[PDB]
Amino acid sequence: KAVWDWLILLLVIYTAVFTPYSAAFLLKLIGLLKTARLLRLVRVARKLDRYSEYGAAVLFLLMCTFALIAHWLACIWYAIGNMEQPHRIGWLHNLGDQIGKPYGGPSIKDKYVTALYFTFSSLTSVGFGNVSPNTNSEKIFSICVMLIGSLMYASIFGNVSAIIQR
Amino acid sequence: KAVWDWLILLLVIYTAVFTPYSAAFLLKLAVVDLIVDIMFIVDILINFGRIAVHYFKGWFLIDMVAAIPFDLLIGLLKTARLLRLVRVARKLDRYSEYGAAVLFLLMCTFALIAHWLACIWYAIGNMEQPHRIGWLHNLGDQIGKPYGGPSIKDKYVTALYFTFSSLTSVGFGNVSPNTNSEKIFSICVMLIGSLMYASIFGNVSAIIQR
Amino acid sequence: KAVWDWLILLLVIYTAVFTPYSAAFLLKLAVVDLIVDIMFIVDILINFGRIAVHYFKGWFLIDMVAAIPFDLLIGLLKTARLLRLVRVARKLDRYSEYGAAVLFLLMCTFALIAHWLACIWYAIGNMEQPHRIGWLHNLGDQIGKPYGGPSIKDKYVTALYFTFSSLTSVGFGNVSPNTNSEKIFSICVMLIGSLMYASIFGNVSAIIQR
Amino acid sequence: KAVWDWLILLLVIYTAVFTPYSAAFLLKLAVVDLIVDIMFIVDILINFGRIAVHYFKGWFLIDMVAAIPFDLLIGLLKTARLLRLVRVARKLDRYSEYGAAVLFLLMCTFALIAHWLACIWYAIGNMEQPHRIGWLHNLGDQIGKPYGGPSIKDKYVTALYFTFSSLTSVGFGNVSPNTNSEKIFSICVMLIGSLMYASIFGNVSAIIQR
Numbered sequence: 001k002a003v004w005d006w007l008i009l010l011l012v013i014y015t016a017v018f019t020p021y022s023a024a025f026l027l028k029l030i031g032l033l034k035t036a037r038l039l040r041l042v043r044v045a046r047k048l049d050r051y052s053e054y055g056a057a058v059l060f061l062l063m064c065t066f067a068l069i070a071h072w073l074a075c076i077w078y079a080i081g082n083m084e085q086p087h088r089i090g091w092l093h094n095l096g097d098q099i100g101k102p103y104g105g106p107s108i109k110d111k112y113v114t115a116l117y118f119t120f121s122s123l124t125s126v127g128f129g130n131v132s133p134n135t136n137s138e139k140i141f142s143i144c145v146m147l148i149g150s151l152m153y154a155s156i157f158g159n160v161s162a163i164i165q166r
Numbered sequence: 167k168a169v170w171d172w173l174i175l176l177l178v179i180y181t182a183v184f185t186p187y188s189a190a191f192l193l194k195l196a197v198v199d200l201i202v203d204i205m206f207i208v209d210i211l212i213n214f215g216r217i218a219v220h221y222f223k224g225w226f227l228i229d230m231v232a233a234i235p236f237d238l239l240i241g242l243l244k245t246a247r248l249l250r251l252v253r254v255a256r257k258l259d260r261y262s263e264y265g266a267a268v269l270f271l272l273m274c275t276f277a278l279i280a281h282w283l284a285c286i287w288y289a290i291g292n293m294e295q296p297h298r299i300g301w302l303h304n305l306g307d308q309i310g311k312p313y314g315g316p317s318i319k320d321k322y323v324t325a326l327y328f329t330f331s332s333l334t335s336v337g338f339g340n341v342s343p344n345t346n347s348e349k350i351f352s353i354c355v356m357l358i359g360s361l362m363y364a365s366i367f368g369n370v371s372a373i374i375q376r
Numbered sequence: 377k378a379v380w381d382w383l384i385l386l387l388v389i390y391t392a393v394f395t396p397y398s399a400a401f402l403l404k405l406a407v408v409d410l411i412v413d414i415m416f417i418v419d420i421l422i423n424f425g426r427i428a429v430h431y432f433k434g435w436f437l438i439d440m441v442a443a444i445p446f447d448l449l450i451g452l453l454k455t456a457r458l459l460r461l462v463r464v465a466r467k468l469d470r471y472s473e474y475g476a477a478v479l480f481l482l483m484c485t486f487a488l489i490a491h492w493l494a495c496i497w498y499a500i501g502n503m504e505q506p507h508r509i510g511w512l513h514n515l516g517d518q519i520g521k522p523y524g525g526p527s528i529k530d531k532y533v534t535a536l537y538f539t540f541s542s543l544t545s546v547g548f549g550n551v552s553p554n555t556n557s558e559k560i561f562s563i564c565v566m567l568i569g570s571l572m573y574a575s576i577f578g579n580v581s582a583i584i585q586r
Numbered sequence: 587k588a589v590w591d592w593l594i595l596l597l598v599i600y601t602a603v604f605t606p607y608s609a610a611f612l613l614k615l616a617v618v619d620l621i622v623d624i625m626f627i628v629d630i631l632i633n634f635g636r637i638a639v640h641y642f643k644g645w646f647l648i649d650m651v652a653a654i655p656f657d658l659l660i661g662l663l664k665t666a667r668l669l670r671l672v673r674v675a676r677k678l679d680r681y682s683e684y685g686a687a688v689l690f691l692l693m694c695t696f697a698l699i700a701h702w703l704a705c706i707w708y709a710i711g712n713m714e715q716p717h718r719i720g721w722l723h724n725l726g727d728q729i730g731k732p733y734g735g736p737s738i739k740d741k742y743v744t745a746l747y748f749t750f751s752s753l754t755s756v757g758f759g760n761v762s763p764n765t766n767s768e769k770i771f772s773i774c775v776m777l778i779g780s781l782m783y784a785s786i787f788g789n790v791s792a793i794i795q796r
């Protein structure tokens with residue numbers, strides 16, 4: 001029971017990683033109900049008293065949730081860009097043109113890596129200029145991403161800057 | 167009375183959102199603003215026999231100038247309705263009773279400044295439009311709608327997106343100032359956004375720990 | 377005498393703004409220059425009869441060096457007028473009592489550092505101009521003034537906008553370094569910004585906490 | 587002995603700068619490297635009859651590993667000199683008293699992390715040229731030296747400039763990752779840059795108050 005909770009947290013991280021990714025990339029309709037597995041995060045929400053023993057554990061958890069929200073935003077971004085694609089506008093067409101794989105199109109690995117890279121650059125406020133929103137849906141998604149990204153950036157990194165002394 | 171002032175705050179936020187938009191993007195329904203101004207007249211009637219002179223000596227004039235209809239550049243006089251923000255500024259103690267309320271107020275004012283700067287950005291872009299240098303021409307080309315050009319929705323979304331990116335210090339590169347007026351306004355927006363982040367999110371860090 | 381210090385501070389701000397700008401751009405009004413020189417001569421005269429010996433060893437040499445005209449490129453020696461900053465540097469006791477004064481000083485030093493970096497950026501971009509890779513060629517190509525070339529106003533606004541975007545961590549992508557000297561200067565600007573942005577905005581957050 | 591400690595710190599900085607640069611770029615002078623090796627041999631000799639037992643069972647293994655010549659890939663095997671950083675990491679007491687030497691050390695480790703990331707970035711980029719995709723091809727196109735391509739100076743300056751921009755969250759848009767390896771490396775660089783910003787410059791904000 002002492003080490004059961006760490007394994008439970010690792011498996012909940014696994015399922016919270018691989019449910020949105022599958023539901024956003026691998027469909028290419030009753031299987032959509034599998035998205036309800038995300039409710040398992042309440043276990044790690046309620047086990048904070050046991051998880052927060054060490055400050056390095058809190059830093060690892062903060063990095064993990066930042067990466068997790070980046071992954072979820074990447075999945076949403078790919079879903080948005082995939083809905084518009086079969087209807088040179090949109091990020092998927094530009095990505096296919098850039099890597100020399102005209103839309104066929106880029107492989108799933110390339111699309112996921114591009115989406116995660118764009119989401120990380122937006123959340124960290126770098127904006128490399130390689131990937132830029134170009135449609136109304138993409139622009140509104142970007143606006144929401146920067147809003148909640150300012151919020152989560154402030155909260156997460158203020159917590160980190162408070163803990164680092166400890 | 168608390169519910170009344172919270173509803174007053176909601177209506178103040180509504181008019182602050184909808185006045186600059188109608189000033190800039192419109193003038194190329196009215197039932198909502200008619201209801202809002204009628205309800206604000208009801209509020210000023212509530213705010214006023216012994217305390218009427220005290221209120222008249224205090225904040226009566228500021229509300230009065232912001233409550234007189236301008237029905238008779240001619241249509242631009244409605245920008246004076248933005249003065250109602252001090253109605254919320256004067257009673258900030260009531261709103262600062264909870265940490266969540268302060269957090270929501272900070273986010274709301276950040277979005278409100280972004281909206282106001284978006285309206286100013288569109289006004290700057292439009293005043294130079296009839297003179298491929300401005301941002302409106304680039305927007306038209308990128309969206310595949312070369313200059314009727316982009317619609318009102320596309321133009322507002324692009325202005326808000328550029329303003330949010332500049333304030334948050336992302337700089338996506340899709341929209342970049344190209345004329346001197348755009349460059350100066352962008353410098354001002356960068357300073358405003360730096361101040362926004364510093365002050366607001368220092369306050370946010372202060373609240374979250376408690 | 378009571379208000380002489382703030383007038384001297386304003387004069388120092390003026391010369392700090394207009395000496396690097398003149399040296400970097402206008403080398404290829406004199407009345408205000410003469411007025412400023414006469415005002416500084418008056419200041420050094422009244423700064424002084426048993427205390428003259430104390431000043432002779434204290435700060436007279438620096439003020440005398442910064443006050444002597446160099447007219448006999450003779451204009452490059454006029455950069456010595458930038459030495460007047462020690463007058464406000466040493467008098468920090470008076471200027472650090474009002475919190476609003478401290479905030480205004482921080483804003484002015486941010487703007488001054490950005491202006492100096494813009495002047496250095498233009499000097500770098502112009503020293504390599506006669507040698508399609510520099511930022512001046514791209515600026516001329518993108519604003520519709522192909523090299524001729526852009527006006528002085530356009531060049532200054534572009535340089536200041538690039539410097540502000542670099543210091544504020546926006547990086548708009550309109551102006552991007554494309555030469556070894558430009559890239560090295562951009563790295564130096566990145567380091568100086570990492571220090572100065574953090575320090576100044578931490579101080580500003582501290583004042584806001586008050 | 588303090589002079590010896592500071593000289594050893596300077597030599598540690600030198601080797602941490604020049605062995606990864608050599609490994610990344612110069613593969614496919616030596617007098618200074620030989621002098622530094624002899625100096626570190628002198629240092630490990632100095633590190634030593636009652637005290638030799640403590641050193642032999644203490645830090646002698648790491649120092650011996652970092653001091654044994656590998657002149658029998660040798661160019662890649664010379665990287666084993668990077669373990670000399672423990673020699674400064676284990677004497678942090680001596681380098682924490684000036685109150686500004688530690689700030690200089692923070693700036694130096696900023697520059698060192700940026701330089702190492704630049705070396706890794708160039709190592710990633712150069713391995714893909716045999717296989718207009720890649721940052722080296724774009725660099726060649728931009729600076730007007732199409733792929734023989736850019737010189738070693740241009741490649742190093744571009745790599746360091748991109749790494750600094752990524753860490754400092756500017757993203758100038760001149761250099762942008764395009765391959766999966768470049769994108770993943772950039773993701774990692776952004777993450778470590780954010781974390782290092784938080785930690786290191788929280789420490790810097792704490793230190794600048796004194």
Ligand SMILES: O=c1[nH]c2ccccc2n1C1CCN(CCCC(c2ccc(F)cc2)c2ccc(F)cc2)CC1
Nearest residue numbers: 123125149150153334335363543545569570573754783
């Ligand atoms: O405001 C925001 N809204 C946002 C919304 C979403 C996401 C982020 C948002 N953000 C902030 C993100 C962090 N960013 C400051 C980084 C300091 C940086 C630096 C460097 C040089 C410089 F000149 C200025 C700033 C630096 C980086 C690494 C370091 F090690 C040290 C300092 C300010 C914008």
